[PDB]
Structure formats: C-alpha cells, structure tokens
Design a binder for this molecule. Structure first.
Ligand SMILES: [Cl-]
Ligand SMILES: [Cl-]
Ligand SMILES: [Cl-]
Ligand SMILES: [Cl-]
Ligand SMILES: [Cl-]
Ligand SMILES: [Cl-]
Ligand SMILES: [Cl-]
Ligand SMILES: [Cl-]
Ligand SMILES: [Zn+2]
Ligand SMILES: [Zn+2]
Lengths: 509, 60, 500, 51
C-alpha cells in the first residue's frame, strides 16, 4: 500500500525523464522503469499512465542503445501479463513498434517482442488486425529461419492466431513461402510444443485452396506422416486433420508408403476422430492411384476398413469414406480380385448390403452401391450378396430413383446408373437372374434403353444382355418390346452400349 | 467422381473407363483455435546518478 | 516615497555601478509597499531608469531587483501603462535570455500581465521578437513557468495568423506536442492545448502539428478528469483530422473516440463523430480498426440518439459511409448496420427536415448498404426506393432549369445497386423511371452517364424491362456511349445493348 | 462488367468535412504565481534622513 503510493509520484517523474532529449537521461530512466515493472504495485502505476506507456513505446522504437531497447521491450513484456497492460500497449502504438522490433539483431529484444505480441494476439481485442496491417505476417514467416525451438513455437502460434479464419493472412503467408518453411520444421525438429504449434498453422492453411498445393509440393504429407504415432495425441490429431484436408490434392505423391501403412493401423484406434480422419485420408489417397491401392491392400487395409465399418454403425462420417475406400480398393489394380474376396472373408457383405437401408442417406447409399458393383465381380460373392438381399433393395432403390428423375418442374440419375450397373454384374449368376426377373424388372430396364444418359443406356443394355442368355428371359424381353429401342442403340458413339445392344438382339433369336 | 459377339462382349465387360469411378471428398476442417497458454518461456544506485535523479533518489 | 524617487532616480543614472546597485535594491524594496509603489509608477523618469538599468547591469542582484520591481508595478493599471510607455517590453523580451531563473520568471510574468491587460502589448511583443523567444523557452522544465509562457503564446496567437506562422517557423508545434506527452500539471496541459487549438485552424501549422505526433499526443488526455482539457483536445483533434490520413499508431485514439460517442456531453459526441468521419476518409487501416472496436454499432447508436441534430448526424452518416466501402471489413460493416437496427433511421434521414448535405451523405450510405444482398429487402421495406426516386426527379428537374448534379448522380447510383435485386427492379420500374434513366444517358457528366447505364444494365436483364428500355429509343445514345472514354460507361452501355 | 462493378476508382468517393473552431479566447486568471541606509555612503544619507 505504501509501494503503490510511492509509485504514483515516481511514474510521472520517470515519464518526464524518458521524454528528455538527453539520451543519457533517457537510457537511465529506461532502466529504472524496467526494474519497477517487475513489481506489481509499481507495474500498476505504469500501466495506468497513458503518457508513461507512450514514452516507453516511443523510446523502444527510436533508441539506438541496445540496453534501452532491451529494458523498454522488457517493460512492455511485463505489462502484457495484465489486461490493463495489454490495453495500454495497444492504445499507445505498441503494436507497430513491437512489429518493428521483430527485426532486431538482439535476441533478447526479439524474444521480448515476439512474446509480448503473442500475449496481445491471444488476449487483446484488435491486436490481430493491427499486426496484420503492420506487416507482422511477412516478418514472422521470415523469422521461421531461426533455430531456437521455443522461439519458433511462439512464432508459429502467432501465425496460427493471425491466419485462423482469415483468408487474406493465409495468402500472404503463402506469398512469403510459409508452407515450405512450416513443412521444413515438421521434418526437422523433435520438440513437441513446436511440432504441435506448427501443425495447427498447417491445419489452418490446409483449408485454403491456394495453400494446399504448396504444402503438398513442399512434401507436407510425408512430413506430417512422421508424427502419427507420437505419444502426444494433440500432435497426432492435428497432423490427421491437416492430412485429411490436403488429401484430395495429394493423390499423385510418392514416398507415401509409410504414411499409408500408419493410416491402416490408425483405423483400429479407439479414438473417433483418429478413425474418422484415417478413413477419410485413405479414401482420397486411393482415388485413381493403383500404387496406393496395392500398398493399402498389402498391409491388410481391407480387413481394417471392414472392421471400421462394423464398429461405426450408423455414423456416416466414418462409413462413407470407409465404404468409398473399399470401393476404390476393389477395382482397377493388380490385387482387386483378392480385395473383393477379402471383404467377404472378413464378414463385410452383410453390413455392406445393410448400408443400403435407412437411416443411410444418399451419399452413403451411392458409395455402397458402387462397392457392391465391384464386389459382384467376384463369383464367390454372387450367392452371398443374393442371400443378403442385395437384389430386392437395389431394385427398390432403382425404381424410386428413376421415378424421381421423371418429374419435371446426389442426383438420382447417378442412383439409376449405379443400381442398374450393380444388377448388371449380379446378373452374371443364373440364380440371381431368376430373382432379378422375378421382380418384374424387365419392363423398367427396357424403358431405361430410352434414357438420354449414355452410361444408363449401357447398364440397361448390359443387364438385359445377361438376362437374355436364358431363352425364356430373352423371349420375355422381346415381348416387352426391347427390339426397336435396342436397334436404335446400334448407332451410338459408345461401342459398349452398341456391343450390349447387339448382344440382346442376337440372343433374342 | 474422378474418371480414370462373345469375344467382343468380353471386351465390353472388361473396359476400365466404365463406371463406377473413384471419387474424391474435399474436407476442410479448420478447428476451433484453442489458446496455447502453456508454451514455454523465452535503488541505492540513484544516489550516484546526478541531479536529474535527485527527486527520485530522495523518495526511494 | 514621492520625495525619495527623484533621488533614487539620479543614483540609478549614476555611472558608478556600485551606486546603481545599491539604488536598485531600495527601489525594489520600495516597490513592495503599495504606497511607495504607486509613487514609483507615477514617475516616468524613474521607471525608465529601472528599465535601462535592468537590461544593462552585469550584476545579477541588480537584474533581479530591477526585473522584480517592474513585476511589482505590473500588478496595477497605471504600472502596466508606465512600463509600456518607458519601453519595458523590448527590455523584458531581452531578459527572456537570462541564465538566472528569478530574472526569467519576473520577465515572463511581467510580459504576461502586460499581454493580459495592457492595450497595445501584443503588437509590441511581436515586433520585439518575443514569439520566437517564448517558443525557445518551451524546453524549460518548470511547469508553472511553462504554464505562463504557453498562455502568453495563446494570447499572442489567438486570431492572429502572423503570430501562428512565427510560432510555426520557430518549431512551436513539436515543442508544444512534447509538453503534452511529458507533463501532468493540468493548468499547463490546458494552456498548451489552447495554443494547439489556436494553431490548428492554420493550414500551415496543421501538417506540422500532425507530423510531430500531435494526434496521438492529444489522444493521451481524452479520459483525463479535466473536462476543459478533454474538450480542447477534441476541438484541436477535429481541426487537425482532415490532415492526418498518414499517421500510424492511431488505434488508441480511434478506440477512445468510438467510446466518446457514448458521451452525454453533446460537444464531445459531435467532435468524436467529426474526427472519425475525417479519419476514416480514404484510409483503409483506420476503417478496419474502427470496425474492429465496435465503431459501427457506436455510430449507429449515435444517429439513433441524434434525432434531427445534423451537426451530429452528418459526420456520423459520413463515417458510416466511409466504413461501408473499400476495405476488407466493409461487408461486415454493411451487415452490422442492419443488425444494430440502423436501416430504418438511415432511410428516414432522406426525409425532411434533413438538409441537402445530410441527404447527400445518406444517399451515399444507402448506396453502400445495398452492396450487401441481405439489405436489399429491408431497404425496400423502409421505402428507400420511392424516396430516392423522388429526390432524383426533383434534382434532375433543377438541372434542366450541394449541386443537384451530385444528387442526380448519388440517387441514380444508389438505385443502380438496389436494382441488383429482382423485386427491387419491379419497384424501380413501377415508378416510371426508365424514361428518366434513358434521358440521363445524355447527361454531359460522365459519372451520371455511368450510373444511368449501370441501372439500365441491371434492369435490362428482365424481359419486360429490356423491351421498355428499347421502346424509349435507348439504342441511339447507348451505341454512342460505346465510344465513351470512360470504361464503365462503355461496358454498361454495351451490356444494355446486348441484353436487349 | 464484373470489373466495372468492381472498379474501386469509380464513385461514390469518401469526403472530408472542414472544421476550424478557434474558440472565443477565455482568460486564464487562475494560473499559479511563479534603517540600513546608515552603513551606506554619503550618497544614501538623504534617504536615511527622510527614512
Ligand atoms: Cl483483432
Ligand atoms: Cl511455399
Ligand atoms: Cl472390435
Ligand atoms: Cl503447450
Ligand atoms: Cl489562422
Ligand atoms: Cl514543429
Ligand atoms: Cl508535471
Ligand atoms: Cl486556470
Ligand atoms: Zn532493463
Ligand atoms: Zn532586490
């Protein structure tokens, strides 16, 4: 109580001294002020004097004396621990001044500056905007060339705070070469706090369409994959969210073998967010990349994805990408046939067929239909799929989707194409054909021969083709009036549809 | 979605450019931006400072 | 006393300085007593002797005694007259160079009394070169001395441009701003703020005061308990505001100003509004900061409270107009105005008793507010369109018989933006505006041709409207405008034609 | 056309209001304030006589 009282007349007095034109006086006052800022009572008198804080700030950014620059920046850092200190700093032009001190050749000054700014960025309203306007972004990205990891942790977090929800900042960070610098940090250092603060910046940048390609080009996928089994769950989860955001743009990368293997193992995690991300990342990385498909199947990806689906239940945020990954893994690569069989061996057929029913929504249903189309390529799955009731439900989905397309005023055309395509493959089996026909499907299939969509015509012709290999069926198709529309599909620019059209015609005699 | 009589028919059933196509899912989860509040950290002499500091030197 | 005076006078004029010194001492002591004091001041030869002795002695004791004597006479009407008549001013000014404080203090105080009550003192001090000397004394540190010196400058500068220029030439602005950043003595801050206020109406001192960091320096006192200090800082700030788009480190000032908008003192709100309007004029950084700290809501509340007080609403509306365009957070501001219930009152300001300057500002605000789709319907529901049209027709008529040319441009530009909404187009057309817009295509003013072609472009996207545009004969002037040197005009004219 | 509506160089423009209040010029009337003729020569004897 007597210290605070003393502080009240010492502050106005030191304010006069800081404003003196004699640098010797200035420098000496800076020292006392710094020392006073270390004690609460006097620190309070400092933060509560607009002229005192303005003098500290001005002295700091204008002195040519290292000790003064250190003492003033240290005073400001000390004031930043309190709400009123943070406010006074902001109101006294401290932000532009602190951003300038980031260029200081003196570590101690630079450290005081970045730390004071971090406190402002965290707790002072208006500080994020002020730093962006003062060119703080470009300077912080440039400082990523430093090697003190604690310094780097604070600096990367400053960039995270500034970039979050702010597209402009993200573009500037990209402009300054931020992605390459941040990926380099992830590849190099082992300090957990820095790996974590850095992964959050990458996470924030990964949602921006311009930053994704850059991060991926800088080798970000592989670097993030290096920390997926770290004991720090916050580091792992952040690397996972980032990897998932970047994944749709990394389907052409190499050196992904380790990453893919680790993701397959993470599918067995008891952490919902770990599993969700792993499934999503894997779905995207297996899209049109036969090397990744081979890798994922090789390490037991199929069994892991099926278990993921079984454990997931009706959680579509897990099942949709898991089912999409399984679809990608059951076609167009050396081990697709083995993959189609593995789904059955690990009890995936019943759940796969189950996913065609409510509460499943259209996105999931579409992916599931696609997977079934691929699974049906394996003869050993024909009977199991039938026994599970795939045919009745696919037919039902097809009927409903078709009727919706026929109304004037996920697109249902896709459901029509998919369901008919699945029935097409399933029709390769004699017993399935009986069931198919038994559902009064022939009339609908013929009607689809008139579809304006080529892909639809193809699958319509395809299933009729398979069905027509049985005489009683072929005759039924002919009676239904398929000849005319079939005859017309011979002049299609799609030799596939033409081939099937020819076949149905041929078989009908 | 992202794209890639008997004998001839076999060429049809085995065409790679036919659906279904593999597809991409564009995720863009940015998070919540929680605070990193646990990062690690980075007057007798007045009597000998002259007239300019007399006032202070006296009170301290 | 009367009897001694003639004696002491001769002793003062004695060439033996030792004698002079002794004389000066008695005269000093004598000036302390009122009875003898009046005797001294009524003797012209005596005062004149005191004046000469003061500037000529080489003895501090004498210098102090003589200056002190003059200071004592300055406390009386007849004393000031005597000093003035015996040429004390030029002598007192010379004493402002003294290395001895007692002498300096006596001199500046005597000059202050003269400046305060002696008719004719100001002109004399100016000639003697007092201004530059007083300015040079502003680096002294005794605050009671600074209080009096700055008050002398205030007296000399008030309503005297010449004196303000000399203060400027002497480096007055920087020295005055330094006082504002350095001391807490309220009388000094107040006396200094008045000099700054006086200088701030000078077009040459303004830039200098701003460059010395005066805006921020004055901002340091906006929450001082001294209301006179606060208001003088505000008047000065407002005068300087049109000349400060270059300053940085303005966050504190802007934040405080936004807060002072909530004040109960009308002079304070008025100034805050004025300062903000000018500080946001073409400065994206200040626009951003003002939005961040809650300026939109504060400015909307200001308009809501103001009623028909145009001294408050005009700069508030202008500030809002500035804030709702040309900066990253303009979208936010446009939305913010609606959120804080600003649309109704804004549209209302387009009506009587609002005068043209306010109406013009309001039309511009509405124009920017319509850039936000979410404001299209509510602006319509407030009756913005028919009133904008009425103001347009009225102004256009006055141009075929604030300049109405500006109202024609503004209203048509607002309509151009409002027309981005299909329902708003119906309303605009329903007021039979197409004929007028086509006529504007003939305006000699490029900007008017632009918004005319713009709104017609928006309207031409609907069948009925296009056909109506054609039936007006728009084709002729539009094809012509295809050659316009103005890119906007030519682009819009082409679009209308195409759409038709 | 998108460029035209984008054109930041086109109206409306921001504008300034010219203030120049010098005040009235009040007065600071409250500023704070800032027998031996014997030992003396024969020159100051007359004074010592009348005093
Ligand atoms: Cl901010
Ligand atoms: Cl980069
Ligand atoms: Cl399990
Ligand atoms: Cl931490
Ligand atoms: Cl003037
Ligand atoms: Cl100056
Ligand atoms: Cl003071
Ligand atoms: Cl006063
Ligand atoms: Zn220090
Ligand atoms: Zn004396």
């Amino acid at each position: 109580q007597d210290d605070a009282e003393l502080a009240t007349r010492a502050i106005p007095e030191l304010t006069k001294l800081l404003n003196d034109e004699d640098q010797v006086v200035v420098n000496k006052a800076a020292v006392m002020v710094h020392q006073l800022s270390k004690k609460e009572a006097s620190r309070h008198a400092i933060m509560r004097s607009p002229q005192m804080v303005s003098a500290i700030v001005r002295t700091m950014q204008n002195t040519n004396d290292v000790e003064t620059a250190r003492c003033t920046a240290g005073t400001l850092h000390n004031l930043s621990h309190h709400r009123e200190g943070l406010l006074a700093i902001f109101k006294s032009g401290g932000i532009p001044a602190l951003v300038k001190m980031l260029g200081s050749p003196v570590d101690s000054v630079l450290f005081y500056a970045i730390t004071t700014l971090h406190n402002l960025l965290l707790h002072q309203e208006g500080a994020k905007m002020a730093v962006r306007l003062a060119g703080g972004l470009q300077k912080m990205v440039a400082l990523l060339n430093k090697t003190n990891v604690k310094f780097l942790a604070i600096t990367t977090d400053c960039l995270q705070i500034l970039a979050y929800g702010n597209q402009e900042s993200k573009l500037i960070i990209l402009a300054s070469g931020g992605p390459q610098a941040l990926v380099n940090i992830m590849r190099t250092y082992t300090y957990e706090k820095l790996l974590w603060t850095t992964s959050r910046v990458l996470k924030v940048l990964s949602v921006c369409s311009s930053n994704k390609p850059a991060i991926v080009e800088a080798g970000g996928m592989q670097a993030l994959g290096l920390h997926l089994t770290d004991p720090s769950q916050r580091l792992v989860q952040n690397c996972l969210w980032t990897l998932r955001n970047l994944s749709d743009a990394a389907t052409k990368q190499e050196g992904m073998e380790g990453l893919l293997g680790t993701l397959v193992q993470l599918l067995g995690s008891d952490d919902i967010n770990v599993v969700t991300c792993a499934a999503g990342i894997l779905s995207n990385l297996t899209c049109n990349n036969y090397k990744n498909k081979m890798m994922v199947c090789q390490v037991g990806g199929i069994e892991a994805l099926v278990r993921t689906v079984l454990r997931a239940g009706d959680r579509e945020d897990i099942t949709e990408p898991a089912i999409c990954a399984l679809r990608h893994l059951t076609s167009r690569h050396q081990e697709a046939e083995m993959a189609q069989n593995a789904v059955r061996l690990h009890y995936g057929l019943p759940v796969v067929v189950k996913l065609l029913h409510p509460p499943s929504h259209w996105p999931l249903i579409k992916a599931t239909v696609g997977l079934i189309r691929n699974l049906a390529l394996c003869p050993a799955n024909h009977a199991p799929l039938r026994e599970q009731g795939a045919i009745p439900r696919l037919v039902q989905l097809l009927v409903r989707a078709h009727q919706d397309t026929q109304r004037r005023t996920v697109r249902m055309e896709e459901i029509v194409e998919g369901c008919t395509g699945a029935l097409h493959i399933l029709a390769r089996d004699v017993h399935n054909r009986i069931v198919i026909r038994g559902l009064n499907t022939i009339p609908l299939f013929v009607q689809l021969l008139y579809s304006p969509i080529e892909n639809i015509q193809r699958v319509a012709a395809g299933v009729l083709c398979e069905l027509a290999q049985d005489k009683e069926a072929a005759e039924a198709i002919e009676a239904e009036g398929a000849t005319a529309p079939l005859t017309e599909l011979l002049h299609s620019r799609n030799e596939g549809v033409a081939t099937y059209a020819a076949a149905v015609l041929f078989r009908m005699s | 979605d992202v794209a890639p009589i008997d004998e001839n028919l076999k060429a049809a059933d085995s065409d790679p450019t036919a659906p279904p196509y593999d597809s991409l899912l564009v995720f863009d989860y940015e998070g919540s931006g929680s605070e990193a509040a646990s990062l690690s950290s980075l007057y007798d002499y007045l009597n000998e400072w002259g007239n300019r500091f007399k006032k202070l030197a006296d009170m301290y």
